[PDB]
Each structure stands twice: as structure tokens, then as C-alpha cells.
Amino acid sequence: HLTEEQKLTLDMVRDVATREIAPRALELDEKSLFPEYARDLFAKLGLLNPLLPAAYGGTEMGVLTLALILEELGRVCASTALLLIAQTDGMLPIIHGGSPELKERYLRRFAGESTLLTALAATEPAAGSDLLAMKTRAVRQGDKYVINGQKCFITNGSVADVIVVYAYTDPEKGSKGISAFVVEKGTPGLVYGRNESKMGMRGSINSELFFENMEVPAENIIGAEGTGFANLMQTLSTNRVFCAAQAVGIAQGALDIAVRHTQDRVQFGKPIAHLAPVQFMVADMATAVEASRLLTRKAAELLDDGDKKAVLYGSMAKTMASDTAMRVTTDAVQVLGGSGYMKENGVERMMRDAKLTQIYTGTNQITRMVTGRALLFP
Amino acid sequence: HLTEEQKLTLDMVRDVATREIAPRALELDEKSLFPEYARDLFAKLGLLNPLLPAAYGGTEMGVLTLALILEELGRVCASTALLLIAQTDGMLPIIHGGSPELKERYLRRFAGESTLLTALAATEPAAGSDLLAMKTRAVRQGDKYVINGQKCFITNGSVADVIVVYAYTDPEKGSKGISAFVVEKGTPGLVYGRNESKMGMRGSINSELFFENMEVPAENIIGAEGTGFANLMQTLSTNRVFCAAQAVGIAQGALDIAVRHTQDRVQFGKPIAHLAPVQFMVADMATAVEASRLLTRKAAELLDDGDKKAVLYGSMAKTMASDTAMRVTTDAVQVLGGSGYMKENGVERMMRDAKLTQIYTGTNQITRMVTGRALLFP
Amino acid sequence: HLTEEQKLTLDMVRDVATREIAPRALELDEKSLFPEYARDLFAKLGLLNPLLPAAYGGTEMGVLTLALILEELGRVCASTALLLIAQTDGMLPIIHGGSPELKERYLRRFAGESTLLTALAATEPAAGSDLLAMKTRAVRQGDKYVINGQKCFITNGSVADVIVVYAYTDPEKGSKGISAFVVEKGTPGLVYGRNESKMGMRGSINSELFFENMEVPAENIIGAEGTGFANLMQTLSTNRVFCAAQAVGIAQGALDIAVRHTQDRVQFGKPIAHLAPVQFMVADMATAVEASRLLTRKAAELLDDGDKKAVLYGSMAKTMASDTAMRVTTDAVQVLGGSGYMKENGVERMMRDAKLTQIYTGTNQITRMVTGRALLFP
Amino acid sequence: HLTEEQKLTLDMVRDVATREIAPRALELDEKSLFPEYARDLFAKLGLLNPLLPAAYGGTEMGVLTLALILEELGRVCASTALLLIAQTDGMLPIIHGGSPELKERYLRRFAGESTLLTALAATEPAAGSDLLAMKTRAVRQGDKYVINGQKCFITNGSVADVIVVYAYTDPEKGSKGISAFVVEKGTPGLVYGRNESKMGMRGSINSELFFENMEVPAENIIGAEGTGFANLMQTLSTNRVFCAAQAVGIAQGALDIAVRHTQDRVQFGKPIAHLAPVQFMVADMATAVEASRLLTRKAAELLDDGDKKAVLYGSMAKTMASDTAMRVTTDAVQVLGGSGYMKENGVERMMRDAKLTQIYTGTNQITRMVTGRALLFP
Numbered sequence A, B, C, D: 001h002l003t004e005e006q007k008l009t010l011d012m013v014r015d016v017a018t019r020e021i022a023p024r025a026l027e028l029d030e031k032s033l034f035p036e037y038a039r040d041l042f043a044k045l046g047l048l049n050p051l052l053p054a055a056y057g058g059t060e061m062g063v064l065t066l067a068l069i070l071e072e073l074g075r076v077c078a079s080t081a082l083l084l085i086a087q088t089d090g091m092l093p094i095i096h097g098g099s100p101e102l103k104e105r106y107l108r109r110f111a112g113e114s115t116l117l118t119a120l121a122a123t124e125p126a127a128g129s130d131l132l133a134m135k136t137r138a139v140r141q142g143d144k145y146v147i148n149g150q151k152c153f154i155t156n157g158s159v160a161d162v163i164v165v166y167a168y169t170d171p172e173k174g175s176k177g178i179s180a181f182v183v184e185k186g187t188p189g190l191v192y193g194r195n196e197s198k199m200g201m202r203g204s205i206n207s208e209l210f211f212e213n214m215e216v217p218a219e220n221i222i223g224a225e226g227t228g229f230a231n232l233m234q235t236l237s238t239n240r241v242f243c244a245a246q247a248v249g250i251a252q253g254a255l256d257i258a259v260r261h262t263q264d265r266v267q268f269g270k271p272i273a274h275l276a277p278v279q280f281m282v283a284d285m286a287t288a289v290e291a292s293r294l295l296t297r298k299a300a301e302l303l304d305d306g307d308k309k310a311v312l313y314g315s316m317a318k319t320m321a322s323d324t325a326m327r328v329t330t331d332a333v334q335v336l337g338g339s340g341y342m343k344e345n346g347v348e349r350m351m352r353d354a355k356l357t358q359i360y361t362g363t364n365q366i367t368r369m370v371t372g373r374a375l376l377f378p
């Protein structure tokens, strides 16, 4: 059952999504804007940092609540849902790995109505699916770590006030040689590259980062040296459920437009909703959205429960929800016919946005591998 | 949350399925046997009539409990799960439509450890998907109804002690002209036709029934004249969730055999579980089984709650669970390679059994129409 | 076997596609440009009007040749292939329906290296899949027809020198009440609406047309009054094969980028081409492209032969080729991972372009209906 | 273009398939009979050994002709088509690898109207997809090879007069250590195991073979020692096109029954052919059959031409044709509703038969690997 606080938060999110976020979505994509209005509004409503612990002035809502929020935002603006995914994802390594000292030092600035942003920087040109191939190095030198390397596809990378950077402290130790570091905006040696032009989720920032003899305090390390890969893998287990929730939302939003169109669009003397093939298309789309929603909610509940099964169910939810978003948005454009292909009608943007969900937070090939390995090697 | 009585019932069902039902499945299919051992065992354990109300000496365990039982039996023997589907389905019209007098007269004989069987007779050669095209007639004549017609594909039809027969009392009134009647075994004019040879679910009885001037007491009518189509439609809404549960079970049983085979079968110097394409196949199969399971459990809970949404969610569950059973069993035979095609290894039977789930309780074309209509014309 | 003239034309097209069309494709989409360079180049090389008869100063290459050209152009720029589809489609009603007088009067201006454009205007806001619902009217008044109505989604509509307009001359006669007319650019009463902003094929012009008491010479009618629907249906049978060829090309071009990426992209210590799931993805993509190509070539050959089977095989080719373009481009973006979602790498544009092929020249729901009707009611 | 001799052969095959083979198919499956009538009839009509060279008293009709024959037989009886696949497959290693002396000695007995049978024995319990893992050994001892080992799933193994046996002459040399041998029926040490009970293609013989100190003349070796794996791989490239052709036939036969049923079956007051979803199902089934047919014919033509591309196109044809047979037969049973599940109506047998085409001649996972490797490593 949902708590009264969860129900109040979700009623507020649904209201904000409908009244404020949905009317802004077309322009956000058309002009490739960072959702500054949404970011500031969310900060004021206490929606920007839902997983920030109560100890650091946060709402500490849990994974299920954020999954429900993401579905609501994904329904109207995938890019606005991405802001919340990147924001929570950027602080999870600190919340789950940081010492009490590091947590107080860096989480406090995100308290209450703070508008400060986070980012997670793991991916590199040489390390996408193969994260162990990352080349960024962190070398201890007195009271500092000297970081040299690069990162790419970093959501909110160039605007984040706090970035969690993964780097090898010992390349010879492989999966036991990566460490995680808090890197602040304004650190000398932190260089911003290009903001890449994407097919979809255009109302976002996706940055290249360069570290050129970047010195960070030795006390900025998250956990012990060599525990970074485990910290990253734990963070990915959670963010895959966020991706799943956003994909369920995208699929639902596209389905809602398709359904309304079948009721209003008249061909062959009646609304197209009267045609059996249109009914079958809508039946298949809705069934896949509901199945993806149930898998996602189960995975989110398991994460909140600290259940080991969360890895398997989150991997299933991510694969199915994103494949469903791709298939449903492709069919929603189809249901609208020619009008579906027009930018003014939104479903084409939802289709472009959907494609990213199959790729980021780990591709659906990697998530099928994670699922298969969990099933065959329990 | 599951009650302690539900948990005890399910632990017992899982034990019986593994120890008693699974070792009998190969012979049940090979020799096309009625599962008499299972029927008698279920009666003794109070598993034969789970939906029989407490008022008539029943366990009244509800739809969710029966869905969980059907998934457990479907895992090892689809034909044994069909015995429970047919048994419950045959008494639902009486439980939900019969007068207090009719219910006492006919439901009492199913109390406790009774081994008496039921059947539902609606389908005819001229009326499958188009149930309104049924030709069986019931004519009031004094204190009796004289029934003339035929039925086909009637599960347990030739062995049922009580048969619910649907017949037109007024052919001109269509959906308002059908009535439902209790017909007992041994009634003069009740004639048995052939027991049809099927592709799968061979451990069952599928009967043709003929009614030749068959006189039934006027007090054997279920509800008022003309309410039979609504009674039938209500029964099918529930029956579709039972089909879904059996299909989830079939899919799970096939998946279990496939998983065990990947772990034991060595090719290219290692178990085939180490091959990425095999991991992807298993990932896809498990994800579809879990999604079908969640949809089915939701539909079952909605039916128990008496929620109007149960029609939509049951229709989605039936379509997806049966398509998943067909897809998963086809892939489980694939995972076993040549051994998968051999009768001794069970998965080929599961594949044959799975195909029926897409057809009976209404085809997946009819269920997609029901889903689409519920979504587009709420 | 291909004629020596066909082989020379195709070698030239392949050269032009690689050297001239492919380097222009990114900018054509980015800046939504009409492919003026391509149009002028094609006119000089005799590629703009391949189906123009030799009698009117044309190359009269036939359907198979144009299908092969469209696959070659579709591989590098779907929008440039669309220019040739719209160009041929706009003159087919005149070639196949026009009197010798009308053909001389209007086809002569397209002779040799002419750069003049055609368009076909059938679709309206009220008439997409249901073409019989078109509202445009043509009323005979002395030596003129007065045309009143509107058209939408007209490829090259606002730039065409000659437009074939379909309109009712007798609304009470339905399929026997539509007529086709030659409408010239500069005719008083011809009004241009908006050029719609689309998801893909952005290097094109898609116009709204309005006819406000538009007077056309009575001698501009194509064939007899009431034969317009048959003329339109014959034109659609051919243009569906052109759509199929363009879709085969799009799918091939996306596959080529994906294949090259698997060979160059190293993850897990080797190019990703060494990973079995990547090999399976590429196997499935290539198989679907080849099957679509063989169906399309068969349909094109049947059209050239004047074979009645061309309707069935063209409908199959259109459905499969466009579904294949959608599925293959979606998977090509997947194979490139994050880089696949970036505008600089082309496959995302190919994915956006692919979606239109499932919708225009009749949706894949209409083409499945055409196929099904031809199979079940021969 | 088809030769007049090919057209005469195919008209004869179509006549025989309709008049003689189709009426026998139900009983052949029901009673698991070897198609002795068909074998004897084919021998008399010169259809049993189509690839036997003219030099050894054969028709030498080529791969395309046999592919067309297999599609015709697959349409009515997959098991009868399997007899021709096994027969040709069993002599291909000798035709393509045997010395002139060995070819005269063993191929002559198959001349004209001979009813003698062949078999190919490569697969073993330890070696299915991984053929290099085969354990059968051949040890040179004077003028003989002493063979020890076992084989399983050998089509016509227990009834073949000539068996091509693959065995290691040098286990340490892997792919360069296998040799191929002619083994005659009646050789001491040749032991027959069980004839395995299968899901489908029941009108066949699937044998276990044991070689217990089995002495064969040293002159019975096919080619040089160690060339056996190349000989086997070459045979499989051809055998995969035969599987594809049989699968196209199975799919077509199931489609034909489905089409006829839609025309005859009345529901909702009209034949079910009038329902749009039924038209879509038939459209999809026919499109996949035609695409599979075109791929198969292309692959067969390339094999006859001795073109290197035959490996790639044969692998694509095998995968798509067999997946299409599985999908189309599953949907043909669906189109017949309850009647589709009944043994008397044939489509259920076609569905059971179709599943084997995805497994034998190499699984569809192995064929996707072969396709992907050929595309990515040309």
C-alpha cells in the first residue's frame, strides 16, 4: 500500500506534469533547452532530490516513490524525467559508499530547496558496455589524488556542482582497482568538451569531460581504494529501475495520445476505434505497458526492501520497459497516421526519446546478459 | 498479502505437483488418460473444488488462490491443471446466478471430499467465437424444459455429473434470449458423441454432447429466462484468468527444463549456459513468464475484489500468458536441441499443450477485441 | 537479366549516390533543404524522369530500373529517393490515363534535361486511408471545371509545375464519381498552405493545397469523368513498389553503418563483431533486408510484365520492406550504442526516415488489408 | 529460367503430392510409418535420387530442382519430404569427395529405379552443434579401418544400405583429424539402437548407431584422411537449403488449409475471411512464406552456380524458412480455432513437423552464427 505522504507527493507530481511540464515539452525538445523551469519548480516542491536522506535535509522517499514520479513525468516529458534520473544517480554513490564525513561535507548542500546539480561520470570513449576498460587514472600524491582522463555522454556533466568520477587507482587489479571520487565544479583541471546533439531527449545536457592533472582532496574518495567498481555496479542496479520507470511513462504517454486519436479520428464513416485492427494494436500496446509497469514496480519494491532478487527483476524491468517504449511509441506514431509523423503532435518526439531508453543505463544486450547470468548461475 | 491458509494450501499443492503429478504427466499424455488419480487425491486434500462456497461445504478460497494452484499444476501437467479449470468453470454459473433453492439442490453434492464432476456446455459447431449463433433450444412444456441441440469441445462433458447447458429460450431476442440450465448425468435424451483426439492436453476428455428431446425439471433453470448470455459472459471473465494462470505454469515448467538443460549440456567445452545467445534466450523467456505472472495475479486480485477493471486485466493476462506459453515452450524445445523434440523429455508435450491456451476460453483474437473495446470505449 | 543500358544507369546511380548524394544527406536533414543540387544533377544525367515515355522525350526505363535506383538512393538519402518517387508518381496518372492530346500537351515539358516538377494530390484532412471520403469537388461550367477543396501531405505540392488533382465530379456515384485533373502552377485559385515539419525525410516539401474557385480547362481532365478512382488505385499499386524499394535502401544503408561499426568498435578486448549476440543481430537484419529486396524486385518485374499478381506482390513488398526498414534502422542505432543516438552518425536520421515508409503510399494496415483481400477473395 | 525437363518433373511431383502423398499423410504420422509406398513410387518415377550424377545412372537435376520438389512434398507431408532430404544428403559426401573408384563402386547401385537407401551419420550424444566433439574413431589396421563409436538422430540410419560415417582418424588434429567412410548395411560390428519417438515428422526413422570393432575396407574412405570435416561442412551448406525448401513447403501447406478454412467457416453471419484481423493474419503468413521461398530459390540457384555466396544465402534461407514454418503453422492452427487443435485436420501435425526444421541441419542459433560470421568477417 502507498503511504499518505507517497499519495500526496504523487497527486502533486501528476498535477505538475499535466499543468506545467506537458505544455513545455514541445519547446524543450524544439529548442534543446535544459529544463530550468522544472528544475527550479521541483526544488521548491521538494521533488528534485527524492532519495536525499533525512539526515542531510532530504525527503528520503525511496525507490518505489521515485519510480512512480518518473512514470508520471515520462508520460509528458522524457527529458524532464531524465533530469530527476541524473540528479538522483549523481548522489547515490555518495549516499551508498561515502564515509559519514564525506556525506556531511557534500550532501548538506542539496538540503531542502537547493537547486544544485549532480552527475555520474563512468562512461568513456574506450569504455561503454565494457566499463572495466575505462582509462581515467587517479594517482595519490600527498594530500591529493591527481586525476587524468576523459568521460563522455555525462548527463548534466557540464552543469553539475558535484560529479562522481570513476577512475583506476590500480590498473593491474581490474575490477578491484577502480575508485570513486567527488569532483566539484570549479576544480582546476576539470575541462568541458562538447554538448552532443542527439536524436531525442533533447531537453538535456550530455557532456564530454576532460581531467588534465586535476587535483582533488584525498578526503574526496568515496569508500576505500578499489571499491569503486562495486559502488558503480550497485548504482547501476538502481538506475536501471529508474530507466524502466521513465520508459513505462514514455510508453503510457504515447498510448494515451494514440487512444484519444482513435476516438476522434473518423475514417470509413466512424471513429477508427471501431476498426478491429486498431483495437488489436491498442490491446497489444496497453498490455505491454501494463506488464512493463508491474515488472518495474516489483523491481523498485525489491530495491527498497534490500532484496538480492532486485538485480534480476530490475534487469528484466529495464529490458522490457524500454523495448515496450520503443515498440509502443513506434505504433503510436502509426496510429496517428500522417499526423503522427508531424512534430506538432508529440508522439514522434516520444518515439525519438524512447530509443535512448534501450541504450543508456546499460544497453538491452548488457541487461539481457545480466538477466541470463543471474538465472543460469544463481 | 497471502493468508496462512493460502500459504499452507500452496505449499501442499507444490509438494503434490512435484511428488505425484509430475511423474504421471508423461504417461497421462502418452496413453490419453483422464487424471483419475489426481482427481481422487485432490478431492481428499480439498483441492478439487476451491471456489465452492463455505455455505455448501466448500473451501471458498477465491480466484487468486486458484490462480496460484493452476500455475503450480500447469508447471508439471497442463491436463491436470485443466481438470481444475473445467471443475470450477462448471459450477461458477450456479454459484453466480442460481437461486438459493437451486444452489442447495446442486452444490451440496460437491461438499468436502466429493469426487463428482462438473462441465460447462456453451460451444457448438455453429457457435465458437460467435456464441450468440448457438442453435440448442429449450422449450417450456408444463413443469419441464425440453432441450434439443448439440455441443462440442465440452471438457469432461461425457463424465460430468452436473452440466451447465446454455440454450435459446427465445431465438428472436439474441443476447436476451439465452438461458442456462442444470443438466444431470443420466437424464434421458442426453447423448454422448465422440471424445476428440487433440494435439495436446491429451490427459483430458473433450466431448460432443447431443440433446434429443431431453426433459429437464423447470426448476433446473439458472436465474431468469433470457439472463443466460450475461451468466455465460461473467463465467468467461473468470475462466480467462484460469487459462492465464495455467499458461503461466506451462511457460514456467518449460523454462525450468530449459534452464536445467543449459547447466548440464556441454558443447564447445563448457555447459551451453556459458554461451551469450543461450543467456539471451533464457532472459527473454523468464522476463515474459514474470510479466505474464504479474498480469495474471493482478487480474485474479481484481476479480476477488469485485472490481470492474477485472475484465480488462483478465483479457490482457489471458492473451499475454498464452502467447508467452506458446513462445516459451517453442524456445524451450529449441534450447534442448534434438533432445527437445523427443517425447521422453516433456518439453515437446508442453509445447503441444501451450497451443490450446491461445484458443480455448476464447481465442486470443477475441480476447484482443475484448481488451481493445474496453480501452477505447470505457 | 539486366540490359546493358540498365547496368550503365545503375553503375552511374551508385557512383552519384556515393560521391554526391551521401556527403549532402546530413545537411539536407539538418537544414530541411529541398535537394536542389540532386534535382539539377539528376536532370542532366537523365535520372529525374526514368518512366517518362520515349515518345515525349523520356528514357522509359521501366519499374524494375526505378526500383533499383531507389534502393541505391535510399541507402544514402531517403529524402533524395523521395524526390524521384514524387516525380514519377506525379506523371504516372497522365502516362496511364491521359488522351494522346493531354499527354503531348503536358508530358513534352518534362523531355530531356527538364527540371520541372510534378506532384500527385489525392489525400485530404478528411481522406487519408479512406480516399473515397475526399471532399474536393470539380464542377463542369462551360469550357472549364471549377475546383473547390483542399489537399494535405502533398510531396512537392507547392513547387510542382504540374499537379494531378483528384476530385469528385459526382459525389453520389462514390468509387465511380471521382475524376483526375492536370492543374498547372500559376492557376488562379490554387493556394499554398503550410510546409509541414516532420520527424524525418526533412529534405523534402510536404504541402497543404487549397482550391478556391480554381478554374481549369475542361481539356485538362485525365480520362473520362468517373474513372479517377481506378486511375488513382493503379498509380498506388506502382508507387507502393517505389516505397518498398526506398525502404529496402534505407534498411541496407543502416545495416552497412552497423556492420562497419562492429568491425571497428572494440569492447571486451576485441571488435564487437566477435560477440555472438552482435552476429545474431546483424544476421537477422541482413536476412530481413535480403527478403524485402527479393519481394520488391519480384513486385517490380510483375508491374513491368503487366501481370495481375503485381497488386498482391507489391502490397507484400511494401509492408515487409517498410517494417524491415523500421526494425533494421532501430537495431542499427542499437548496434552503434550511444554513438548511434548522435546526429553526426546518420543512423538516427535513417531511423526517423524509416518510420514514414510504414505510413505513406498507404499505411501498413491498409496494405495488409489489400494483401489479405487479394489472398482470400481472388 | 526453368528447363522443360524441370517443368515436367515439377508438374509430375505436384500431381503425385496431391493424389498420392497428401491422402497418406494422416496415417503416416498416426502410425509412425516409414513412407514405403512413396519411396517405391519415387524410385519408379525417377524422383528418389535427383542429385545422382548422369555418370552413375542418375537424373542429375541439381539443387534448384530438388528445392522445388521439396517445397511441393513439404506442402502435404513433411516426413515424405524428409525421405528425399535424407536420401540426397546420404550420397552428397560420396558425389563430392569420393575417388572415381569409390564413386563407381557405391553410386552405381542407386542408378535408375533402385530403391536402396542412404544415410549420413555425423551427430553423436556428445556432438550436436559442436561436431568437432565427436568421439567415433577410425583406426587403420592393414587393409581395413576399425571403427568404434556411436551416432544418434541418424535419419534412415537403421534402414540405409550405404551410410556415410564421420570419425576421427587423428583426435589431436581437430578439424584436420576427421575422415569420412562408406559403411554398408550388414557390416559386422554395425549395431542398431533405438528408433526415437519424436514430436513430429513421425513418418520417419531416426536411429542410434553403434560401431563395435566395425571393420571397413581401407578403400571405403571418402577422400584423404583428415578431409572429413571439410566434406561434412560442404554437405551441410547444401543440406540447409533442403531444410529451407521443406520448411517453405510446410508453411505453404499450413497457409493453404488456413485460407480454405477462412472461406468456409462462418461466424458473425459471414465467412471469417471477411474479418479484418483474419485478413491481417493471412497477409502476414503469406508474406513470410513468399519471402522464405524467394530466399530459398536464390540460395539453391547460387549452389548450382558454385557461387561462394551460397553459404551466406543458404544460412539466411534455412533460418527464415524454418522460423516462418514455425510461425505460420502456429497461426494456421490458430485460424482453424478449436478444429485446428484436432488431429483429423492436419495443421496440428504441420505445426509439430515445423518445429524440427528449426533444429536439424544445424539449429537456427548455429545458422545465425554462420550468417553473422559470413557478414562480419567476409
Ligand SMILES: CC(C)(COP(=O)(O)OP(=O)(O)OC[C@H]1O[C@@H](n2cnc3c(N)ncnc32)[C@H](O)[C@@H]1OP(=O)(O)O)[C@@H](O)C(=O)NCCC(=O)NCCSC(=O)C1=CCCCC1
Residues within 6 Å of the ligand: A085, A086, A089, A120, A122, A123, A128, A129, A130, A131, A132, A155, A175, A229, A230, A233, A234, A236, A237, A239, A311, A360, A361, A362, A363, A366, A370
Ligand atoms: C555487466 C558488465 C558488462 C561487467 O561485466 P564483465 O563481464 O566485464 O565483468 P564481471 O566478470 O561479470 O564482473 C566483474 C566484477 O564485478 C562484480 N559485479 C558484477 N555485478 C555486480 C553487482 N551488481 N554488485 C557488485 N559487484 C558486481 C563481479 O562479481 C565481479 O567481481 P568478481 O571477479 O566476481 O570478484 C558491466 O561493465 C556493465 O554493467 N556495463 C554496462 C554499462 C552501463 O550500465 N553504463 C551505465 C552508465 S550510467 C547511465 O548510462 C546513465 C546515468 C544517468 C542518466 C541516465 C544514464
Ligand SMILES: CC(C)(COP(=O)(O)OP(=O)(O)OC[C@H]1O[C@@H](n2cnc3c(N)ncnc32)[C@H](O)[C@@H]1OP(=O)(O)O)[C@@H](O)C(=O)NCCC(=O)NCCSC(=O)C1=CCCCC1
Residues within 6 Å of the ligand: B085, B086, B089, B120, B122, B123, B128, B129, B130, B131, B132, B155, B175, B229, B230, B233, B234, B236, B237, B239, B311, B360, B361, B362, B363, B366, B370
Ligand atoms: C465477445 C463475444 C464475441 C460477444 O461479442 P459480440 O460482438 O457478439 O456481442 P456484443 O454486442 O459485444 O455483446 C452482446 C451482449 O453481451 C453483453 N456482454 C458482453 N460482455 C459482457 C460481460 N462481460 N458481462 C455481461 N454482459 C456482457 C453486451 O453488453 C451485450 O448486451 P447489450 O446489447 O449491450 O445489452 C463473445 O461471444 C465471446 O466472448 N466469444 C468467445 C467464445 C468463448 O470465450 N468461449 C469459451 C467457452 S468455455 C472454454 O473454452 C473452456 C471452458 C472450461 C475448460 C477450458 C475451456
Ligand SMILES: CC(C)(COP(=O)(O)OP(=O)(O)OC[C@H]1O[C@@H](n2cnc3c(N)ncnc32)[C@H](O)[C@@H]1OP(=O)(O)O)[C@@H](O)C(=O)NCCC(=O)NCCSC(=O)C1=CCCCC1
Residues within 6 Å of the ligand: C085, C086, C089, C120, C122, C123, C128, C129, C130, C131, C132, C155, C175, C229, C230, C233, C234, C236, C237, C239, C311, C360, C361, C362, C363, C366, C370
Ligand atoms: C484500399 C482502399 C482503402 C479502398 O478500399 P475501400 O474499402 O474503401 O473500397 P473498395 O470497396 O475495396 O474499392 C472501391 C472500388 O475501387 C476499386 N478498386 C480497388 N482497388 C483497385 C485497383 N488496384 N485498381 C482498380 N480498381 C480498384 C474496387 O474494385 C471498387 O470498385 P467496385 O465497387 O468493385 O466496382 C483505398 O482508399 C486505399 O488504397 N487507401 C490508402 C490510401 C493511400 O494509399 N494513399 C496514398 C497517397 S499517395 C503517397 O502517399 C505518396 C505519393 C508520392 C510521395 C510518396 C507518398
Ligand SMILES: CC(C)(COP(=O)(O)OP(=O)(O)OC[C@H]1O[C@@H](n2cnc3c(N)ncnc32)[C@H](O)[C@@H]1OP(=O)(O)O)[C@@H](O)C(=O)NCCC(=O)NCCSC(=O)C1=CCCCC1
Residues within 6 Å of the ligand: D085, D086, D089, D120, D122, D123, D128, D129, D130, D131, D132, D155, D175, D229, D230, D233, D234, D236, D237, D239, D311, D360, D361, D362, D363, D366, D370
Ligand atoms: C559451425 C560449426 C559449429 C563449426 O564451428 P566451430 O566454431 O566449431 O569451428 P570453426 O573454427 O568455425 O571451423 C573449424 C574449421 O572448419 C572449417 N569450415 C567451417 N565451415 C566450412 C565450410 N562451409 N566449408 C569448408 N570448411 C569449413 C573452418 O574454416 C575451420 O578450418 P580452419 O581452422 O580455418 O582451417 C559446425 O560444427 C556446425 O555446422 N554445427 C551444426 C551441426 C549441424 O549442422 N549438424 C547437421 C547434421 S545433418 C542433419 O541434421 C540432417 C541430415 C539429413 C536429414 C535432415 C537432418
Ligand SMILES: Cc1cc2nc3c(=O)[nH]c(=O)nc-3n(C[C@H](O)[C@H](O)[C@H](O)COP(=O)(O)OP(=O)(O)OC[C@H]3O[C@@H](n4cnc5c(N)ncnc54)[C@H](O)[C@@H]3O)c2cc1C
Residues within 6 Å of the ligand: A086, A120, A121, A122, A123, A125, A127, A128, A129, A130, A152, A153, A154, A155, A156, A198, A206, A356, A359, A360, A361, A362, A363, A364, A365, A366, A369, B276, C265, C267, C268, C272, C275, C277, C278, C334, C335, C336, C337, C338, C339, C341
Ligand atoms: C544520452 C546518453 C546519456 C547517458 N548518460 C550517462 C551518464 O550520465 N553517465 C555515464 O557514465 N554514462 C552515460 N551514458 C552511457 C551509456 O550507458 C552507454 O552509452 C552504454 O553503456 C553503451 O555504451 P557505448 O555507447 O560505448 O556502446 P558499446 O558498448 O560500444 O556497444 C555497441 C553495441 O555493442 C553491444 N555490446 C557491447 N558489449 C556487448 C556484450 N558483452 N554482449 C552483447 N552485446 C554487446 C551493445 O549492446 C551495443 O549494441 C549515456 C549515454 C547516452 C548516449
Ligand SMILES: Cc1cc2nc3c(=O)[nH]c(=O)nc-3n(C[C@H](O)[C@H](O)[C@H](O)COP(=O)(O)OP(=O)(O)OC[C@H]3O[C@@H](n4cnc5c(N)ncnc54)[C@H](O)[C@@H]3O)c2cc1C
Residues within 6 Å of the ligand: A276, B086, B120, B121, B122, B123, B125, B127, B128, B129, B130, B152, B153, B154, B155, B156, B198, B206, B356, B359, B360, B361, B362, B363, B364, B365, B366, B369, D265, D267, D268, D272, D275, D277, D278, D334, D335, D336, D337, D338, D339, D341
Ligand atoms: C480442447 C478444447 C476445450 C475447450 N473446452 C470448452 C468447454 O469446456 N466448454 C465450451 O463451451 N467450450 C469449450 N472450448 C471451445 C472454445 O472456446 C473454442 O473453440 C473457441 O471459442 C474458438 O471457437 P471455434 O473453435 O469455433 O473457432 P472459430 O470461432 O471458428 O474461430 C476461427 C478463427 O477465426 C477467428 N475469429 C473468430 N471470430 C473473430 C472476430 N470477431 N475477430 C477476429 N477474429 C475472429 C478466431 O480467433 C480463430 O482464429 C474448448 C475448445 C477446445 C478445442
Ligand SMILES: Cc1cc2nc3c(=O)[nH]c(=O)nc-3n(C[C@H](O)[C@H](O)[C@H](O)COP(=O)(O)OP(=O)(O)OC[C@H]3O[C@@H](n4cnc5c(N)ncnc54)[C@H](O)[C@@H]3O)c2cc1C
Residues within 6 Å of the ligand: A265, A267, A268, A272, A275, A277, A278, A334, A335, A336, A337, A338, A339, A341, C086, C120, C121, C122, C123, C125, C127, C128, C129, C130, C152, C153, C154, C155, C156, C198, C206, C356, C359, C360, C361, C362, C363, C364, C365, C366, C369, D276
Ligand atoms: C510526409 C508524407 C508524404 C506523403 N505524400 C503524399 C502525396 O504526395 N500525395 C498524397 O495524396 N498523399 C500523400 N501522403 C498521404 C498518406 O498516404 C497518408 O497519410 C496515409 O494514407 C494515411 O492517411 P492518414 O494520415 O489520414 O491516416 P488515417 O487514415 O487517419 O489512419 C490512422 C490510423 O488508422 C489506421 N486505419 C485507417 N483505416 C484503416 C482500416 N480500414 N483498417 C485498419 N486500420 C486502418 C491507419 O493504418 C493508421 O494507423 C503523404 C503523407 C505524409 C505524412
Ligand SMILES: Cc1cc2nc3c(=O)[nH]c(=O)nc-3n(C[C@H](O)[C@H](O)[C@H](O)COP(=O)(O)OP(=O)(O)OC[C@H]3O[C@@H](n4cnc5c(N)ncnc54)[C@H](O)[C@@H]3O)c2cc1C
Residues within 6 Å of the ligand: B265, B267, B268, B272, B275, B277, B278, B334, B335, B336, B337, B338, B339, B341, C276, D086, D120, D121, D122, D123, D125, D127, D128, D129, D130, D152, D153, D154, D155, D156, D198, D206, D356, D359, D360, D361, D362, D363, D364, D365, D366, D369
Ligand atoms: C529428428 C532429427 C533428425 C536429424 N537427422 C540427422 C542425421 O540424419 N544425421 C546427423 O548426423 N544428424 C542429424 N540430426 C542432428 C541435428 O543436426 C542436431 O540435433 C542439431 O545439430 C543440434 O544438436 P543437439 O541436439 O546436440 O543440440 P545442442 O548442440 O546440445 O544444442 C542445444 C541448444 O544450444 C544451442 N547452441 C549450441 N551451440 C551453440 C552456439 N555455439 N551458439 C549459440 N547457441 C548454441 C543450440 O542452438 C540449442 O538451442 C537430426 C536431429 C533430429 C532431432
